[PDB]
């Protein structure tokens, strides 16, 4: 199926405490595989997935130097945005960037993207065309004009269609045993009493990969999505994910509800009852 390469970058200033903290975290699909943290003793790009041991010393040195260069660029941006927004030098501010590309099963580009945020709000983003930018406010409009005059879109497009895609294919090839695997969900239902002759039925899906999954509760053959409570799919600490979805039902009528689990690792969806 399709796969993605994403980098989550965060720069946070801290007036009075020295230089801003700078972090870069990379993911291939839903798996963290590399990380850079300026607050580490000796900041360096580091592998976060076992298969990255396949990259030689040059890779780590190159990514580390690039990260330090990016860190310096963001230090400048934090200062620049204080000016654009006419803010004080004593407050903490955050810049966030998500950059990435997605390819189909054949390794060809599906889409690329790069979006910026300042203090948790949209700042500027590359449009789907990979040619123009969309600015959220007048400060971002200044940036948009600067980048157009410098031809930044063309440079970024080259990265997205070329560098990003090519590295993603390489990571998928080297880490195939991990990234192309399928771990089937194991499910179970828990029961909890409530006041007013009602019960909470919670359906759990554990140890699966990839992260995409669908959990629904049914009654009489119809789904109860609007009556369900749930948590966003979440990492379980070992590279797998988990999720739960619950519904409140009448005491004594539990046997009438069924949990359905759909996943890449389930040739036939699972159907469970309490």
């Amino acid at each position: 199926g399709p796969h993605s390469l994403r980098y989550f970058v965060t720069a946070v200033s801290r007036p009075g405490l020295g230089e801003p903290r700078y972090m870069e975290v990379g993911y291939v699909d839903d798996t963290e595989f590399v990380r850079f943290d300026s607050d580490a003793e000796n900041p360096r790009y580091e592998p976060r997935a076992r298969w990255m041991e396949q990259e030689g010393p040059e890779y780590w040195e190159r990514e580390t130097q690039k990260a330090k260069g990016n860190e310096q660029s963001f230090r400048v941006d934090l200062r620049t945005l204080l000016g654009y927004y006419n803010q004080s030098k004593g407050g903490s501010h955050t810049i966030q960037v998500i950059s990435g590309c997605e390819v189909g099963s054949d390794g060809r580009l599906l889409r690329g993207y790069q979006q910026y945020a300042y203090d948790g709000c949209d700042y500027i983003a590359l449009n789907e065309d990979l040619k123009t930018w969309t600015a959220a406010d007048m400060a971002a409009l200044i940036t948009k004009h600067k980048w157009e005059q410098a031809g930044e879109a063309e440079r970024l497009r080259a990265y997205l269609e070329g560098t990003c895609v090519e590295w993603l294919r390489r990571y998928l090839k080297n880490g195939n045993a991990t990234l192309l695997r399928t771990d089937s969900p194991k499910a179970h239902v828990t029961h909890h009493s409530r006041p007013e002759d009602k019960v909470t039925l919670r359906c759990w899906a554990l140890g699966f990969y990839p992260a995409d999954i669908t959990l629904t509760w049914q009654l009489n053959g119809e789904e109860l999505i609007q009556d369900m409570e749930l948590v966003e799919t979440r990492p379980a600490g070992d590279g797998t994910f988990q999720k739960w979805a619950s519904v409140v039902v009448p005491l004594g009528k539990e046997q009438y509800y069924t949990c359905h689990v759909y996943h890449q690792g389930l040739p036939e969806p699972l159907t469970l009852r309490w």
Partner: peptide, 8 residues
């Protein structure tokens, strides 16, 4: 490999 980012 992450992209190189430049000043806004």
């Amino acid at each position: 490999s992450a992209p190189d980012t430049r000043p806004a």
